[PDB]
């Protein structure tokens, strides 16, 4: 109570820190897991239905 | 849709028999497709069914030459059953399930049909 | 053919008309999975009734199905003169395993 | 309300020792387009407010 503070939401440094966090957690999820790089090769496509 | 069957004239007894229907403004995978055959006098017993992806199933009092297939890039389904005796010699239907395409209990779409008079 | 019919039906217009088609336990009474069929002489047959009680789209609703136990009856109302088809039922057997009946020709 | 009415099946590929590849094997029954709905009148109100 008898308490104002000063806020500003467009220079606080949590937004910072959860946009680093989350892009650490989603890099660190994708080391264990398969590397597709045999995939890069000529395909030959054609349509699904006719 | 539309189902136009094939088969080769009159079949010799020990011949064996091959049928085809293709399909058109279809895809011929993910869709039940079974095989309907009727006497002359009184029929519709169905001989096989089968799917792209999920497990097939044929009559009992037929599976011992009931071999048939699907083609993908023609767009075609293939009864080729073998054993023939006189005494089965019927017209034959070719259907496909509804829109669900896991069903194989009714046959909304039907074909044309052939004779395939055993000699 | 275990599924089995009388052989044929008759009656007089603006009557109606019902179809018995019977089966063994193991057969009608394991599912729901019955079906009824029409076809003329020189036609293929098309689906009147389909899953015992319901019907495709785009077909009069003169035709139902009751499922009495392990029998099941059709009833036709209100027949007229282009209603003389043959009328075959089936239903499943496991495995998915279909299994026809005789027919029933009804004339009038 | 979203919705993909498509009915996929999942295929395994072994591309190594131990490295599997999931492909896509087919679709059962009628191809359709994935699409989304919202309500109409809610919308109309929720521009309106913005609108004020
Ligand atoms: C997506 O596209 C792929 C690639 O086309 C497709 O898979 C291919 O399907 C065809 C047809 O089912 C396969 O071709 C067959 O392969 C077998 C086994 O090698 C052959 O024995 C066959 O030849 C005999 O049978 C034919 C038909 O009865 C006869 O006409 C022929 O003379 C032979 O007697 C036939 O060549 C092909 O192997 C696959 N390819 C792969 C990589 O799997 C697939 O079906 C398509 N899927 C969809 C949903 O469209
Ligand atoms: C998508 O297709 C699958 C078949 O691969 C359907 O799975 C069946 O669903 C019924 C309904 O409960 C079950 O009784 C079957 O046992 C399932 N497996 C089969 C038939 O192999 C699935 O229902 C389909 N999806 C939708 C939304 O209909
Ligand atoms: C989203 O909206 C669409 C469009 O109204 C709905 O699609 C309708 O579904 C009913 C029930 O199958 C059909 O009778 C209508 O013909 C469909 N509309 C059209 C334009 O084809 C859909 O059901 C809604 N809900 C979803 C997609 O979850
Ligand atoms: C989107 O989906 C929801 C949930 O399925 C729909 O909400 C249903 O609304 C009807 C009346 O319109 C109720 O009878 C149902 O009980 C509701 N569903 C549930 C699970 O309670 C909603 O109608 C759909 N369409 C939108 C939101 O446009
Ligand atoms: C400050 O807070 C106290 C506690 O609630 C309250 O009694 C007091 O009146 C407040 N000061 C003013 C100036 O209102
Ligand atoms: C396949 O799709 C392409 C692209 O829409 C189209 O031009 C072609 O006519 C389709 N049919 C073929 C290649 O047989
Ligand atoms: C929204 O609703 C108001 C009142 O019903 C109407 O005047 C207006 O035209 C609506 N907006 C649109 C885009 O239809």
Known sequence: ?50 | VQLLESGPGLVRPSETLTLTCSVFNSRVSGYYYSWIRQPPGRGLEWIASTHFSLRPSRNPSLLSRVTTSIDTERYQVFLNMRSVTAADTAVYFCARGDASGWRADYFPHWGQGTLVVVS | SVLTQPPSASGSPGQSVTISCTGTSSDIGASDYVSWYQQYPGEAPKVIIYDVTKRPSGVPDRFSGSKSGTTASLTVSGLQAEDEADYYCSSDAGRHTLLFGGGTKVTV | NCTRPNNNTRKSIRIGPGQAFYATGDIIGDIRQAHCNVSKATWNETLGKVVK
């Open chain 1, 1 to 50: 109570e008898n308490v104002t503070e000063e806020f500003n939401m467009w220079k606080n440094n949590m937004v910072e820190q959860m946009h680093t966090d989350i892009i650490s957690l989603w890099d660190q999820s994708l080391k264990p897991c398969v590397k597709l790089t045999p995939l890069c090769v000529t395909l030959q496509c054609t349509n699904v239905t006719n």
